[PDB]
């Protein structure tokens, strides 16, 4: 199992979160929400396959972003 | 033209940026990169149609994220 896949997953996880926040802000058009839904189903498939916690994954992503932001605010 | 579409776009823009950073980190599996490419082409279509600067959109997004983070670190 490639690690890059795990990292890419953690990213998609954090992203999905931020997205859900964008929708909760009542700023969803229709395609973004639809994609978020289809993304959730896919996230659940990977979450089950990988059997990795999405909540903890989102946390790791947060740090992954802060690490990339630390290199360039 | 709904504003929610503009906001959703700004978000996708910022997201595309963070994503590009994830790939630049040499953590791309294959599907994430492919999606990034197809996302770029679509981003260019919206960038041309909307005629909005991607760099400017990414900026506004950064604030959109900080605004959502300010509501909950």
Curated annotation (Swiss-Prot), chains A, B:
Residues 1-73 are annotated as: RNA-binding and homodimerization. A motif (Nuclear localization signal 1) lies at residues 34-38. Upon interferon induction, ISGylated via host HERC5; this results in the impairment of NS1 interaction with RNA targets due to its inability to form homodimers and to interact with host EIF2AK2/PKR. It is found in: Host nucleus; Host cytoplasm. A motif (Nuclear localization signal) lies at residues 34-38. Disulfide bonds: none annotated. Homodimer. Interacts with host TRIM25 (via coiled coil); this interaction specifically inhibits TRIM25 multimerization and TRIM25-mediated RIGI CARD ubiquitination. Interacts with human EIF2AK2/PKR, CPSF4, IVNS1ABP and PABPN1. Inhibits post-transcriptional processing of cellular pre-mRNA, by binding and inhibiting two cellular proteins that are required for the 3'-end processing of cellular pre-mRNAs: the 30 kDa cleavage and polyadenylation specificity factor/CPSF4 and the poly(A)-binding protein 2/PABPN1. In turn, unprocessed 3' end pre-mRNAs accumulate in the host nucleus and are no longer exported to the cytoplasm. Cellular protein synthesis is thereby shut off very early after virus infection. The dsRNA-binding region is required for suppression of RNA silencing. Belongs to the influenza A viruses NS1 family. This is Non-structural protein 1.
């Amino acid at each position: 199992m490639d690690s890059n896949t795990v990292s890419s997953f953690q990213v998609d996880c954090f992203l999905w979160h931020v997205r859900k926040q964008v929708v909760d802000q009542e700023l969803g058009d229709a395609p973004f929400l639809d994609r978020l839904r289809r993304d959730q189903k896919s996230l659940r498939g990977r979450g089950s396959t990988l059997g990795l916690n999405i909540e903890a994954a989102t946390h790791v992503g947060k740090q992954i972003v802060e690490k990339i932001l630390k290199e360039e605010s």
